[PDB]
Design an enzyme around this catalytic site. Structure first.
Site, short mmCIF file in Angstrom:
data_model
loop_
_atom_site.label_atom_id
_atom_site.label_comp_id
_atom_site.label_asym_id
_atom_site.label_seq_id
_atom_site.Cartn_x
_atom_site.Cartn_y
_atom_site.Cartn_z
N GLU A 214 0.83 -1.19 0.00
CA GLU A 214 0.00 0.00 0.00
C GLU A 214 0.87 1.25 0.00
O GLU A 214 1.83 1.35 0.76
CB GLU A 214 -0.91 -0.02 1.22
CG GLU A 214 -1.83 1.18 1.36
CD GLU A 214 -2.71 1.10 2.58
OE1 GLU A 214 -2.86 0.00 3.18
OE2 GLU A 214 -3.27 2.15 2.96
N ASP A 216 0.26 5.17 0.45
CA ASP A 216 -0.72 6.19 0.83
C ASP A 216 -0.25 7.55 0.35
O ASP A 216 0.72 8.11 0.87
CB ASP A 216 -0.94 6.20 2.34
CG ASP A 216 -1.54 4.91 2.86
OD1 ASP A 216 -2.34 4.28 2.13
OD2 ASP A 216 -1.23 4.54 4.01
N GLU A 219 -3.76 10.63 3.33
CA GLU A 219 -4.62 10.30 4.46
C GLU A 219 -4.84 11.65 5.14
O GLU A 219 -3.88 12.27 5.62
CB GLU A 219 -3.91 9.35 5.42
CG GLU A 219 -3.45 8.04 4.79
CD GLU A 219 -4.54 7.02 4.59
OE1 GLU A 219 -5.55 7.05 5.33
OE2 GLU A 219 -4.36 6.14 3.71
N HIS A 230 3.87 1.50 2.75
CA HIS A 230 3.65 0.24 3.44
C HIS A 230 4.07 -0.95 2.55
O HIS A 230 3.23 -1.52 1.83
CB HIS A 230 2.18 0.01 3.79
CG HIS A 230 1.54 1.06 4.66
ND1 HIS A 230 1.39 0.90 6.02
CD2 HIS A 230 0.91 2.21 4.34
CE1 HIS A 230 0.74 1.94 6.51
NE2 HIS A 230 0.42 2.74 5.51
#
Length: 442
Positions: A214, A216, A219, A230
């Site tokens: 992942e 990001d 956020e 991640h």
């Protein structure tokens, strides 16, 4: 999942731009599909719900295999996008309403390619990804997120023949949290040992989780924002059980296949509290729209190099705004994600560097090289009330201890039952998406 026959699936058209040089872009006629969790699940040859509220029907779904045989997920027609799910498009802008009143709470969606049969896969190494965002109506406890995950382009259809819908029905979701709340995993209902989540009338957790890498990009709400890598070992979609999921509840957060914390650059947490916030004297004013630019730098400046750096800058009302910097005594003033930044900041914060354990920026890059699916979502947080993003985490921690304070929100904020009333009309907008070589999108 089988596909139901009650309603045609009609994704929302969303054009993006693919660019070769600054102001030289061409339209790519993509579309937005709703995640399969939000779909009506009913009997294959009828109208009877297989899932209602936060429970599977035990007669129809005594086992996952029987559930999968008996049940099907159905389409989202155009009228239902706004009326039921709170999704709409105007030109190149996509809007997601948090609560839509029969009452829908949050949404997760994916970008389809121009055929509308596969996710638009982005090979992000040595590229720049850019979009305009409005999070002015999102306050403490809410998150309007834009991110990439290592889903399969067909949602797993080729791997799992019981998955009849594929990307067309928003199937195959996985992320670095290895979530058990995904209703369909590896082509099967995740109905074994299904447990409702208390205080969440729509959601539960099944036996399996679904893990994958992942990235990001965003956020955020109007109070705090973060970008985070991640990696997982491996990066690709992996159904998990037991310790491999790295479940929080069994003390396994750091024992699983994915880096759950990720390596984050969050301006406020990095000790610049004046960079981003809801007002004109913050450097970046979250009460107004702005452009978010992300550059994925490799070791040799080519598509074949290892991922080495996630750079970030912003544009607001024509004003270029460089990223904030890490601001602690004796720590280098990093303004990007690198392996060194991750080691130094996690060292300071006393956070376990699971990012490094999972192969670091290089491993994150391998996911990005294979291609990742774009996710756009709006959600509240039934586990941790979004305190990790926008408050003190842990809530009992001293806010002067580096790493604890992530935003100005009170530690009592973000209770889903409260935010679902108080912020019912919150809407995140993502628009004017642009993708191309480094330096090409503004």
């Amino acid at each position: 999942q089988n596909v139901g026959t009650q309603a045609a699936e009609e994704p929302l058209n969303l054009p993006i731009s693919v660019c070769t040089a600054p102001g030289n872009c061409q339209t790519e006629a993509d579309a937005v599909v709703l995640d399969s969790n939000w779909r009506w699940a009913h009997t294959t040859t009828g109208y009877t719900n297989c899932y209602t509220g936060n429970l599977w029907d035990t007669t129809l779904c005594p086992t996952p295999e029987t559930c999968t045989t008996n049940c099907a997920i159905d389409g989202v027609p155009l009228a239902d996008w706004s009326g039921t799910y709170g999704g709409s498009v105007t030109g190149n802008k996509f809007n997601l309403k948090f609560v839509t009143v029969s009452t829908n709470i949050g949404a997760r969606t994916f970008l389809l390619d121009s055929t509308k049969t596969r996710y638009r896969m982005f090979q992000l190494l040595n590229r720049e990804f850019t979009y305009d965002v409005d999070v002015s109506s999102l306050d403490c406890g809410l998150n309007g997120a834009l991110y990439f995950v290592s889903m399969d382009a067909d949602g797993g259809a080729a791997k799992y023949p019981t998955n009849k819908g594929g990307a067309k029905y928003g199937t195959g979701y996985c992320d670095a949290q290895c979530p058990h709340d995904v209703k369909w995993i590896n082509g099967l209902a995740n109905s074994k040992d299904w447990t409702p989540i208390p205080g969440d009338a729509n959601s539960g957790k099944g036996y399996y989780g679904n893990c994958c890498a992942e990235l990001d990009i965003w956020e955020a709400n109007k109070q705090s924002q973060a970008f985070t890598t991640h990696p997982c070992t491996p990066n690709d979609q992996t159904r998990c059980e037991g310790v491999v999921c790295g479940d929080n509840d069994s003390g396994d957060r750091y024992n699983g296949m994915c880096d759950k914390d990720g390596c984050d650059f969050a301006s406020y947490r990095m000790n610049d509290h004046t960079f981003y916030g809801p007002g004109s004297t913050f450097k970046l004013d979250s009460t107004k729209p702005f452009t978010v630019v992300s550059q994925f730098i490799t070791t040799d400046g080519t598509d074949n190099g290892d991922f080495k750096e996630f750079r970030r800058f912003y544009v607001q009302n024509g004003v270029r705004i460089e990223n904030s910097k890490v601001n602690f005594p004796g720590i280098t003033a990093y303004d990007s994600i690198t392996d060194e930044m991750c080691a130094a900041t996690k060292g300071l914060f006393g956070d376990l560097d699971d990012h490094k354990n999972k192969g670091g920026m290089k491993q994150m890059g391998e996911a990005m090289r294979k291609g990742m699916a774009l996710v756009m979502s709006i959600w509240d947080d039934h586990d941790v009330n979004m305190l990790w993003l926008d408050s003190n985490y842990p809530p009992t921690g001293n806010p002067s201890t580096p790493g604890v304070a992530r935003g100005p929100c009170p530690t009592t904020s973000g209770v889903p039952s409260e935010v679902e009333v108080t912020q019912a009309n919150a809407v995140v907008s993502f628009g004017n998406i642009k993708f191309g070589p480094i330096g090409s999108t503004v």
